[PDB]
Amino acid sequence: VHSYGYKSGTRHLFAKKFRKHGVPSVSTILTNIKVGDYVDVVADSAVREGMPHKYYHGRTGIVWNVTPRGVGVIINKPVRTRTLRKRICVRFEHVRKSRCQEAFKAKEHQFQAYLAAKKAGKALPPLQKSSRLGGIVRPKNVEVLARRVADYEAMVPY
Amino acid sequence: VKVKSLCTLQIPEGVTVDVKGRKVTVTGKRGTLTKDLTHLQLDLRVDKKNRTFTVIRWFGSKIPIACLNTTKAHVQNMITGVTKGYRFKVRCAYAHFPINVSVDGQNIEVRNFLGEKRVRRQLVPNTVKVSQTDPSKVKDEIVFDGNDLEQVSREAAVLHQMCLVKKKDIRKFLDGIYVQTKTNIE
Amino acid sequence: VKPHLRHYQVVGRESPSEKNPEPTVYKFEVFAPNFVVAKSRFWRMMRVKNKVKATHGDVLSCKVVKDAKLVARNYLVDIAYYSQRCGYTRMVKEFRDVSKTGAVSQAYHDLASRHRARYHNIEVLNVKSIPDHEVKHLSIAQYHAPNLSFPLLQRRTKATRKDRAIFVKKNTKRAVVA
RNA sequence: GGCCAGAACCAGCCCUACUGCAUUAUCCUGUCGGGGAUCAAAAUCCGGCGGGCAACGAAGUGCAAGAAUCUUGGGUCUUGGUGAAAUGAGCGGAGUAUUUGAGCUGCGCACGGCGCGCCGCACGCACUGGUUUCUUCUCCGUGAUGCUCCAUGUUGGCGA
RNA sequence: UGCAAGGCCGGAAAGAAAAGAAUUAGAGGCACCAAGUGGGCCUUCUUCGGUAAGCGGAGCAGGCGAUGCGGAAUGAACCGCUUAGGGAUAUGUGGCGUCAAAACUUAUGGGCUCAUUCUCGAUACGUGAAAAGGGUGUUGGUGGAUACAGUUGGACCCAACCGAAUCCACCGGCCCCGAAAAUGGAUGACGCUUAAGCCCAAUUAGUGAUUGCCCAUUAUUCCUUUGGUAAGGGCGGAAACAAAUGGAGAAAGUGUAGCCCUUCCGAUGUA
RNA sequence: CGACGUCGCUUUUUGAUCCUUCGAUGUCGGCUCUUCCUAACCUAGCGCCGCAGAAGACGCUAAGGGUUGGAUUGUUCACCCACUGACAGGGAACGUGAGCUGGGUUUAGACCGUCGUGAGACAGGUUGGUUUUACCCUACUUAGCUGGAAAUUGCGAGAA
Numbered sequence A: 001v002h003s004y005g006y007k008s009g010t011r012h013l014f015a016k017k018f019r020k021h022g023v024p025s026v027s028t029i030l031t032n033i034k035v036g037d038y039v040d041v042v043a044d045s046a047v048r049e050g051m052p053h054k055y056y057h058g059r060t061g062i063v064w065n066v067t068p069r070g071v072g073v074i075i076n077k078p079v080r081t082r083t084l085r086k087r088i089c090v091r092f093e094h095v096r097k098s099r100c101q102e103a104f105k106a107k108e109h110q111f112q113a114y115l116a117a118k119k120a121g122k123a124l125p126p127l128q129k130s131s132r133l134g135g136i137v138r139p140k141n142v143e144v145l146a147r148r149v150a151d152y153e154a155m156v157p158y
Numbered sequence B: 001v002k003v004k005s006l007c008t009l010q011i012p013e014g015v016t017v018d019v020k021g022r023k024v025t026v027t028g029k030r031g032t033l034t035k036d037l038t039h040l041q042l043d044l045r046v047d048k049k050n051r052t053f054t055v056i057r058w059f060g061s062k063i064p065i066a067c068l069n070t071t072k073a074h075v076q077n078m079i080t081g082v083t084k085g086y087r088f089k090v091r092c093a094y095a096h097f098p099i100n101v102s103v104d105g106q107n108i109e110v111r112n113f114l115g116e117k118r119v120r121r122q123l124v125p126n127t128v129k130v131s132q133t134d135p136s137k138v139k140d141e142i143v144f145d146g147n148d149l150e151q152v153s154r155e156a157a158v159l160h161q162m163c164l165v166k167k168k169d170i171r172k173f174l175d176g177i178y179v180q181t182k183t184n185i186e
Numbered sequence C: 001v002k003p004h005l006r007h008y009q010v011v012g013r014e015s016p017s018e019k020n021p022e023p024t025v026y027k028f029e030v031f032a033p034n035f036v037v038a039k040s041r042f043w044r045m046m047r048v049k050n051k052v053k054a055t056h057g058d059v060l061s062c063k064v065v066k067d068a069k070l071v072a073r074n075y076l077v078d079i080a081y082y083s084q085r086c087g088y089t090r091m092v093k094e095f096r097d098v099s100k101t102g103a104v105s106q107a108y109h110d111l112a113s114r115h116r117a118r119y120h121n122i123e124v125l126n127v128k129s130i131p132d133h134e135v136k137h138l139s140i141a142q143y144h145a146p147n148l149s150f151p152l153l154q155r156r157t158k159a160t161r162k163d164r165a166i167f168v169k170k171n172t173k174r175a176v177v178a
Numbered sequence D: 001g002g003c004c005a006g007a008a009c010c011a012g013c014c015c016u017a018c019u020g021c022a023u024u025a026u027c028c029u030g031u032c033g034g035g036g037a038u039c040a041a042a043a044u045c046c047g048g049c050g051g052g053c054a055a056c057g058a059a060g061u062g063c064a065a066g067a068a069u070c071u072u073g074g075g076u077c078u079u080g081g082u083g084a085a086a087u088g089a090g091c092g093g094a095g096u097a098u099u100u101g102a103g104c105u106g107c108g109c110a111c112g113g114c115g116c117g118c119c120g121c122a123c124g125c126a127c128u129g130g131u132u133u134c135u136u137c138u139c140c141g142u143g144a145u146g147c148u149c150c151a152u153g154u155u156g157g158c159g160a
Numbered sequence E: 001u002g003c004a005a006g007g008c009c010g011g012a013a014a015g016a017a018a019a020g021a022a023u024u025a026g027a028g029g030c031a032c033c034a035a036g037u038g039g040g041c042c043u044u045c046u047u048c049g050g051u052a053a054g055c056g057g058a059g060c061a062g063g064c065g066a067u068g069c070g071g072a073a074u075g076a077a078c079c080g081c082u083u084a085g086g087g088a089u090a091u092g093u094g095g096c097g098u099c100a101a102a103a104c105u106u107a108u109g110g111g112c113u114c115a116u117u118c119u120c121g122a123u124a125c126g127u128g129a130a131a132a133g134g135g136u137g138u139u140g141g142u143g144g145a146u147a148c149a150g151u152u153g154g155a156c157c158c159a160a161c162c163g164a165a166u167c168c169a170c171c172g173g174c175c176c177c178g179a180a181a182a183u184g185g186a187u188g189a190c191g192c193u194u195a196a197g198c199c200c201a202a203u204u205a206g207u208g209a210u211u212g213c214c215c216a217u218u219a220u221u222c223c224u225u226u227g228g229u230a231a232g233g234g235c236g237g238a239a240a241c242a243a244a245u246g247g248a249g250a251a252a253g254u255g256u257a258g259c260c261c262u263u264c265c266g267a268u269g270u271a
Numbered sequence F: 001c002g003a004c005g006u007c008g009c010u011u012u013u014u015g016a017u018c019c020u021u022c023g024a025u026g027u028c029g030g031c032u033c034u035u036c037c038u039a040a041c042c043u044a045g046c047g048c049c050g051c052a053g054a055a056g057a058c059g060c061u062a063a064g065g066g067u068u069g070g071a072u073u074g075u076u077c078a079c080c081c082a083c084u085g086a087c088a089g090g091g092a093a094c095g096u097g098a099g100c101u102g103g104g105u106u107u108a109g110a111c112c113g114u115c116g117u118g119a120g121a122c123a124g125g126u127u128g129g130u131u132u133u134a135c136c137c138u139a140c141u142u143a144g145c146u147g148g149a150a151a152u153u154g155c156g157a158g159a160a
């Protein structure tokens, strides 16, 4: 019956998308991974060397170790009553730089830019107003919402 | 429901119709008749000046409305009972064995029906007059006379039901005492 | 008794956005026990007709429409109901009532008793007061008679609650136990 | 009397009475035209036009904050008391006023027709604006030199 | 002077703005040493084998086991609610004809139903009793056709008298037939049919507004007990005061008749 | 009456399961005796027929009454002989073993055939093989004594 190997139950998981097959591109090779970076572990099915286990597909963690052809990632791993910090050894082709902190980094750089403009006599952008407030609505087009006999005839097939 | 449904009947010159709590009495010549209709729950009225009998059903569905044309037929039947009477002529039909019917006073005895040795006896109520016609005029005829249609029949029916062929083909063996003419006395 | 349904006019639209800076405003007619059910029925029509969700729209008004003065009238109610066996069944029925809400409340009790239809399976299409000469049903047209009268028969007249008794003398009004 | 019962009052709770603001128009009227049915009408019904409050015991519509003190509600055998510190708009002293709402209004600004400044403004915001026509009571006050518990009514019945 | 890494020295810090722009009965982490378990079972949804099973096997989650209480007559598991021991007031599920508390059989609400020997119906779970098929039983829809019509009567397969509404197909609601088992028996029993049945809808009823009523080990509140991951105050005897004729106490405290007082929260449970 | 399809009912058959019982619920049949069911064989009524009569087929209401004697077999079944109006089908712990019987099943002795090297095994055949207890409580059957309407009491008072 069902067996438990390294690649068991990975028929659709370790498969390339339709018309998106092929070995990884040049921009993957030129991407710089550093220790301390957040990375997504997504197995490339065309490489089949340094591949992560099926659990770590879709998991993201920080890089703890960089090696000539490989990357070390620390991944959380809920085991019974606690989560373990697991260090997986994969090739560089199975990791992507993570945009998980992109919105937070953009928020930090907005604050410094706002601070600089505020300290030195500059025009800050106007504050956004809530859309949930009230007001007077002047409707250009007003229609009658009602059920018609045509609605019931339409829904009958054949 | 229908708010008001009614039936109208015309009363002839010599007959009087009285209603009192759904109890109808019809008195013409040759007798008087009574009907207890307290099971019907209708509004019966008599207009003496215009000589008309009306029955009304207020706020009725189909079932109570069917009972006002039944009432109109019943009261009509008493009108033609105490004006003209009811006469039922009943004939005995046989293939081989003559059916000997003997009518005494209010008593009917039937013998030799299909050769049987059992005598069938029927006692006619005093409100129905039973007679045997002259065999010279017409052969094997018995006549029931009375004012009540429901009573003149049910004597002709009881006579018919007692001469029923048993354990034989009924399509063959057509012997019996069947009612032929339903007419009036006058 | 006063009707259990109220005449509501719910007015609403989809919230203005970049795709729809000036959305269409829709006026909806519903007969509901309260305005919370009225708004629920308004957003059910908006979703299944105009593809607008209650979470992406706003309500401009949910007021009650005032009844006309009480006059004995004939009301044409265009109504529909859903059953699993037959699907959608749309009927036009005539009612004798004094108000639009009373006629529609009567039509809801009528569809419940005769067709076992509940409120949320029923859709009212139109209610209007029609003249006597446009009435098709004989059961409604029998009340147009210029001189219409009838006796009150088979009536169970209960006593005033204060004056009701348990045991009463047979042919008197005296109360033995009360 | 440490027993039984009834009424008084206190404090706290728990119930009821007493209601204002907004809303209406698919509405209310009158009149013309149609349409309707009658013995003849009227009405139900559809249109144009003129006015509008179906009117606060109008509406079964949204929200209600109304000091049970004025203006002696009820219950507490569902609490504890009889003033052994009563913190009260309720106790005690003063005073006959202030202010907070409703009317009515000033200027400016917001807001709404129409357009780059005229009209309106239901009466919003600031002057905690102006008037006082009516509607309200407002102002002071008692530490524990009590660490803790217990101990203070009235009227009968029963108990000499 | 670039990249990588370990630091050092400074800077800035809405301590995270505004756009719907979180919330928390949110003290985080770390050990040590031990017990009972290691037959389970049942449900809403997903689900495999089997004709199925009160059958065997799984997924997420609740529950019973381990737990009564209030309800569905009865029932380990359904429904309500979960449990210190007492009161009052409100509820929940379920009810308001009697049994049996509540509509002493409520309304100044609307429809439908008649069921002759397992005797209509009033069974959520509970299939914890029913199908295909049928009904000119009644009362509602939809689409057509006819209308001096349809039906009688006279004349001869066909139109004239007659004087009004008829009939064709198809869908529902309730009721009926389908509908046969062994002790006498079961809407719980009686009984109920201007229901005390079914669907819908109210709360003293077109009058003037938005809480009819009855039942909990639940909710609110009051009294008392008990234990806190409990929170605080007092504890240097203020002064004065014999009997015959205001009193007593006041412990620096885990646990006592608890040092005393105030306050808040929890309280069931098999192994 | 009813192919191809299709919808059901029953629990008098087998299967499936493994809920109760392994400090024990006596395990087949027959005899005996009672009772219940109806899917009705005869008996009472009645429809319908390819219903002339006679005999019969199909169906309805109805379980009040009845439903035998034997050869072979432990047999339930099966089969035949005979009578009859008819010799229907079933349940009650596959009703009924402190009611019987013990033919069968079902130990220990022994024979056979097949199987096994063997001891031994065979829903294969054969022959022989302990059937215990009521005096208890109910239930039934008869047989006695005897109070009691506030069903013992209240004095609590109702006349077919």
Ligand SMILES: CC(=O)O[C@@H]1[C@@H](O)CN[C@@H]1Cc1ccc(OCC(=O)N[C@@H](CCCCN)C(=O)O)cc1
Pocket (backbone or CB within 6 Å): F021, F024, F025, F026, F027, F106
């Ligand atoms: C009092 C008591 O124990 O009754 C228990 C309760 O659980 C209920 N029934 C149990 C007794 C019982 C009765 C009949 C049985 O059927 C016969 C059978 O199959 N085998 C026989 C043959 C044994 C000898 C072979 N060497 C047998 O075992 O008796 C089976 C078991």
Ligand SMILES: [K+]
Pocket (backbone or CB within 6 Å): none
């Ligand atoms: K005294």
Ligand SMILES: [K+]
Pocket (backbone or CB within 6 Å): none
């Ligand atoms: K299972």
Ligand SMILES: [K+]
Pocket (backbone or CB within 6 Å): none
């Ligand atoms: K209570």
Ligand SMILES: [K+]
Pocket (backbone or CB within 6 Å): none
């Ligand atoms: K009713």
Ligand SMILES: [K+]
Pocket (backbone or CB within 6 Å): none
């Ligand atoms: K059917």
Ligand SMILES: [K+]
Pocket (backbone or CB within 6 Å): none
């Ligand atoms: K029908």
Ligand SMILES: [K+]
Pocket (backbone or CB within 6 Å): none
């Ligand atoms: K304590």
Ligand SMILES: [K+]
Pocket (backbone or CB within 6 Å): none
């Ligand atoms: K045994």
Ligand SMILES: [K+]
Pocket (backbone or CB within 6 Å): F030
């Ligand atoms: K024998």
Ligand SMILES: [K+]
Pocket (backbone or CB within 6 Å): none
């Ligand atoms: K017979």
Ligand SMILES: [K+]
Pocket (backbone or CB within 6 Å): F093
């Ligand atoms: K047994």
Ligand SMILES: [K+]
Pocket (backbone or CB within 6 Å): F097
């Ligand atoms: K035996």
Ligand SMILES: [K+]
Pocket (backbone or CB within 6 Å): none
């Ligand atoms: K043997």
Ligand SMILES: [Mg+2]
Pocket (backbone or CB within 6 Å): none
């Ligand atoms: Mg898959």
Ligand SMILES: [Mg+2]
Pocket (backbone or CB within 6 Å): A012, A013, A014, A015
């Ligand atoms: Mg994939």
